[PDB]
Amino acid sequence: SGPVPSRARVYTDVNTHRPREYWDYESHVVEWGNQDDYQLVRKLGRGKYSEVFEAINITNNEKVVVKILKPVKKKKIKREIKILENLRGGPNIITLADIVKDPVSRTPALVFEHVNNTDFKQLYQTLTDYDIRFYMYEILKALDYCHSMGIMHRDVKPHNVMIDHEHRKLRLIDWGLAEFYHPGQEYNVRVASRYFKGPELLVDYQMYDYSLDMWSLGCMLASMIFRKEPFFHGHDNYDQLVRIAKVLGTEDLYDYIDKYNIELDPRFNDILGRHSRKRWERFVHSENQHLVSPEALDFLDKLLRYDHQSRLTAREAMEHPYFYTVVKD
């Protein structure tokens, strides 16, 4: 009785074979830099967990981004720091340049390399078929890297992908929701952002893995190739699942929860209905058809599975025919 357990089908045991220091972030000792090295220039915004600023590193006169954290648990901050340090230098992973103590907030301030980003809302409207494939491949490099390093991002979305379109450079940012994957571990389902939440989160299945990120990526791909951002545009977390079910169908949703011996919230009884699985072609029209190909639709179909175990891994995704036309570096 109770939920049937689940494991990642790749990188399952990466952390158990790393030194304890690698994943035991609660024991991490932070190496603090010199707070005087960074001059704040302008506020970029304020999120749930921090205030973000453009700044200058006065030791090299280079632009950097500074995130001054709102007060939060030392283990959560240590988790983000340890993950950033573990992944530093990896393909398309944002570089943590420094960590300093902000004397006003009395909290840590994380210092990142700057990316000359184009607002995704504006950028996505301009992406060609080739660009979408190219940047999707770049995101996959970052995801296969972090997964291979025992880490799931858990907040993949356009806002967390910074793109310098001029230099064709991409960085996956905002690792504050990321976690180490340990087989059999139950995780918080209150992660990711609504439109990018995987079915596992929406049905409260806690034993999830790297494959969560692949659902989120599929949501991004659908928004890009169909020019509809976000693709699954739910009004709340319940409606989010209904919107998904209107596309993937309710019978396969029941197959998913039945496999894992999960029950839907009874509040779905009055809102879920009965829906057939749709063919992806229904979302194609004259305004997005130039971004769609049989390869794109098959790739999307293989990312957006209810069953997290059935989704392409990041490495499998990079083997897909969709990327045959992308020039390899």
Ligand X SMILES: OC[C@H]1O[C@@H](n2cnc3c(Br)c(Br)c(Br)c(Br)c32)C[C@@H]1O
Catalytic residue numbers? Answer: 155
Question: 44 a known binding residue?
Answer: yes
Name the minimum Å distance from CB 27 to ligand X: 26
111 contacts ligand X (rule: CB under 6 A): no
Side-chain half-sphere CA neighbours of 100 within 13 A: 20
Supply 2's token pair. 């109770």
Return the number of the residue (151 or 162) whose C-beta is nearest ligand X: 162
Give the residue with the Cβ less far from ligand X, 151 or 253.
151
Residue 54 has which token pair? 């453009």
Binding residue (CB under 6 A) for ligand X from 67, 141, 305, 308: 67
**Is residue 117 involved in binding ligand X (CB under 6 A)?**
yes
Measured CA to CA, the distance from residue 194 to residue 88 in angstroms comes to 28
CB of 115 to ligand X, least distance (A): 4
Contact 232, 219 (CB under 8 A): yes
CA-based end-to-end distance of the chain: 50
Which span (76-84, 112-120, 222-230, 287-295) binds ligand X, by CB under 6 A? 112-120
Q: Does 83 bind ligand X (CB under 6 A)?
A: no
DSSP character for 93? B
Does 44 engage in binding with ligand X (CB under 6 A)?
yes
CA 203 to chain centre: 19
Quote the least distance from Cβ 13 to ligand X, whole Å.
Answer: 31
Using DSSP bridges, classify how beta strands 96-102 and 151-152 pair: parallel, antiparallel or unpaired. unpaired
Burial of 10 (0-12, 13-18, 19+ CB in 10 A): middle
Rg (CA), the chain: 20
Q: Which two tokens stand for residue 89?
A: 């230098």
User: Is the CB of 52 or the CB of 201 nearer to ligand X?
Assistant: 52
Q: Is 43 labelled a binding residue?
A: no
* Residue 115 is a binding residue for ligand X (CB under 6 A): yes
**Residues in region 249-308 near ligand X by CB under 6 A:** none
Q: Hey, which bits of 191-243 come out as E strands?
A: none
Identify the H or E element spanning 112.
strand 107-113
Q: Tell the smallest beta-carbon distance from residue 176 to ligand X (Å).
A: 9
> d(Cα 82, Cα 246) in Å, to the nearest integer?
40
Q: Closest separation between CB of residue 221 and ligand X, Å?
A: 21
Instruction: In whole angstroms, give the CA distance from residue 281 to residue 224.
Output: 15
Residue 52 labeled ligand binder: yes
Ligand-binding site membership of 51 (annotated): yes
Cβ contact 254:246 at 8 Å:
no
| Cβ-based nearer residue to ligand X, 191 or 297 | 191
Q: Tokens for 225, please give them.
A: 């190739």
Q: How many residues does the chain have?
A: 329
Give whichever of 65 and 241 is closer to ligand X, judged by the CB atom: 65
Q: How far is the CB of 223 from ligand X (least distance, A)?
A: 18
Residues between 176 and 235 with contacts to ligand X, criterion CB under 6 A = none
Q: Which of 119, 287, 298, 319 binds ligand X (CB under 6 A)?
A: 119
Each residue 144-183 as x (binds ligand X by CB under 6 A) or -, in order, gives: ------------------x----------xx---------
Give me the helix-helix angle, 211-225 and 294-303, nearest 10°: 150
Side-chain half-sphere CA neighbours of 310 within 13 A = 15
Residues interacting with ligand X, by CB under 6 A? 44-45, 52, 65, 67, 94, 112, 114-115, 117, 119, 162, 173-174
From the annotation, which residues make up the binding site for ATP?
Answer: 44-52, 67
From the annotation, which residues make up the binding site?
Answer: 44-52, 67
